[PDB]
């Protein structure tokens, strides 16, 4: 690891610390995730093993590449590929005029492809938040931080309960569903989609019940006609207030009548009925998609 020269600190993800480093041989910028093994009581953390194993089977243009893995005493380095920003910082930097619609469409028709690729490999990202979608100056958006990802078998079984950041948690996860599957990721994307159009978080709750109640307020309170089984779900209480399905023309005003339909399908209560990643790429909304180049501020 004497070949890499650090240039700056990028930030901290699920584990380790990410630095910008330039390879002295080829002179190509690369990201470097560092894990201090000595501080880790239980050897290499499970998140690190899962990532490194999953990221070495996923080679897509929309998933950050794992260039290399290096081990120098008491230190594990993952050499990724360098990307110039994160969607969150881009959205904040464009919080006055907003991301143009073609760019939003392209960014949604580049996360769905990577998500479909992961799902066909039976991988659950489970950490789809704006800080984990990295964008470069060429106009490409890529998934990152697979530390919380998991490879789900056929059939699935009971996996880790509380997953995903609270702001982007599916209602089935909130209500303590026994089995969850790919559908959760789709919910996250919907939450991200409405964030790009509106520029602010769709369901900003500070506690589990608060997030659940914001979801109910926006989308209505689920009954057995829209979500068969809710009224039997472990964390469902009959005392939930009755709200009624705020119209989508007021939830995301700027979206057309096809973007609205795609968002509604992405935000379906019933995980079985919720649109899949590949079933969304055939949506008419992605009929005139392009690849515009963002004008990043650094």
């Amino acid at each position: 690891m004497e070949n890499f020269q650090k240039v700056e600190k990028i930030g901290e993800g699920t584990y380790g610390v990410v630095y910008k480093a330039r390879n002295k041989l080829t002179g190509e910028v690369v990201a470097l995730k560092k894990i201090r093994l000595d501080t880790e009581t239980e050897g290499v953390p499970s998140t690190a093993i899962r990532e490194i194993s999953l990221l070495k089977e996923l080679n897509h243009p929309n998933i950050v590449k794992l260039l290399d893995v290096i081990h120098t005493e008491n230190k594990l380095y993952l050499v990724f590929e360098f990307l110039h920003q994160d969607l969150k910082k881009f959205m904040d930097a464009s919080a006055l005029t907003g991301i143009p619609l073609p760019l939003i469409k392209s960014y949604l028709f580049q996360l769905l492809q990577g998500l479909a690729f992961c799902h066909s490999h039976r991988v659950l990202h489970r950490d789809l938040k704006p800080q984990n979608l990295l964008i470069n100056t060429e106009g490409a958006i890529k998934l990152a931080d697979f530390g919380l990802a998991r490879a789900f078998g056929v059939p699935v079984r009971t996996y880790t309960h509380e997953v995903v950041t609270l702001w982007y948690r599916a209602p089935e996860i909130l209500l303590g569903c026994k089995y969850y599957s790919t559908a959760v990721d789709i919910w996250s994307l919907g939450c991200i989609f409405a964030e790009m159009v509106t520029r602010r978080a769709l369901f900003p709750g500070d506690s589990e019940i608060d997030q659940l109640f914001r979801i109910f307020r926006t989308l209505g309170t689920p009954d057995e006609v829209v979500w068969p089984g809710v009224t039997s779900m472990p964390d469902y209480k009959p005392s939930f207030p009755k709200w009624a399905r705020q119209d989508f023309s007021k939830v995301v005003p700027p979206l057309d009548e096809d973007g609205r339909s795609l968002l509604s399908q992405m935000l379906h209560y019933d995980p079985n009925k919720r649109i899949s990643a590949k079933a969304a790429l055939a949506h008419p909304f992605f009929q005139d998609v392009t690849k515009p180049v963002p004008h990043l501020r650094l």
Binding site: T41, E42, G43, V44, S46, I49, R50, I52, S53, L54, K56, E57, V69, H71, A116, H119, S120, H121, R122, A151, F152, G153, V154, P155, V156, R157, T158, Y159, T160, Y179, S181, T182, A183, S276, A277, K278, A279
Partner: protein, 276 residues
């Protein structure tokens, strides 16, 4: 050829999923002769280790997938080495099981627990070193399709009612544990590595089913699993004579998941009768 056992999947495209699974079956190589490299060891020493790893898995209620991940890690790492002495077998196996538990389970046992079960022959620091050594020798390819992962798919496809619904478990708990019991006694024989994991699972399923159900649920033709069935014959006869066990219950494990917890009963006694 292996046509298309999978039904129409909504969460993904059936063709791509099946192609990826089959390519996984071809990217992780196994060698039945990985013991000729280590002249001191003998096949019986492998079984004794693997049997032991089942027992540990029972003590801590570790899933079957964890044990088969450990078995795959062992039989792949040991194929990349030379002149390994029997004294190091236990450390390699325990490190492999530690890696598998970290990979698969929600709350894997702590490192000190793994060290304790070794009865002092291996320490926490030895396990930490060997786990990194294994993960390096395997080139970080720690996501294979194990022999039980295939049986899960086969049983899901065998018992389907409303099309799709391939991800939610739906199949008897008593038939799955009978085949998994024949697949734990077959796994103790190093010749089991001669056949692909999917073919091993299909052969066990057929041995406890009809020759039509296996082909419906796996897509294999008779000529494909003929050799595996012939080799499995004496391992199935012993299990049939002994009598299949029952679905035991475990503390803290839901009654709908007891079939996914490894159950070491006795394998070195049936293995020597089968090999007879």
């Amino acid at each position: 050829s292996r046509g298309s056992p999978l039904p129409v999947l909504s969460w993904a495209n059936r063709e791509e999923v099946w192609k990826i699974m089959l390519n996984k079956e071809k990217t992780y190589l196994r060698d039945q002769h990985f013991l000729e490299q280590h002249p001191l060891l003998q096949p019986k020493m492998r079984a004794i280790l693997l049997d032991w790893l089942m027992e540990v898995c029972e003590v801590y209620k570790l899933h079957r997938e964890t044990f088969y991940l450990a078995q795959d890690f062992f039989d792949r790492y040991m194929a990349t080495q030379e002149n390994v002495v029997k004294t190091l077998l236990q450390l390699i196996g325990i490190s492999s099981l530690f890696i598998a538990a970290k990979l698969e389970e929600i709350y894997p046992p702590k490192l000190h627990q793994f060290a304790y079960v070794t009865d002092g022959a291996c320490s926490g620091d030895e396990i930490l070193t060997m786990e990194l050594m294994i993960m390096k020798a395997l080139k970080w390819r720690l996501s294979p399709l194990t022999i039980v992962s295939w049986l899960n798919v086969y049983m899901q496809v065998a018992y389907l009612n409303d099309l799709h619904e391939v991800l939610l478990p739906q199949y008897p708990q008593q038939i799955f544990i009978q085949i998994a019991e024949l697949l734990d006694l077959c796994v103790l024989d190093v010749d089991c590595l001669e056949f692909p994991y999917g073919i091993l699972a299909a052969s066990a399923l057929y041995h406890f089913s009809s020759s039509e159900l296996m082909q419906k649920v796996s897509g294999y033709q008779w000529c494909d699993i003929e050799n595996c069935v012939k080799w499995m014959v004496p391992f199935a006869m012993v299990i049939r004579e002994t009598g299949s066990s029952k679905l035991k219950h475990f503390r803290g494990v839901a009654d709908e998941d007891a079939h996914n917890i490894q159950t070491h009963r006795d394998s070195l006694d049936l293995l020597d009768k089968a090999r007879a």
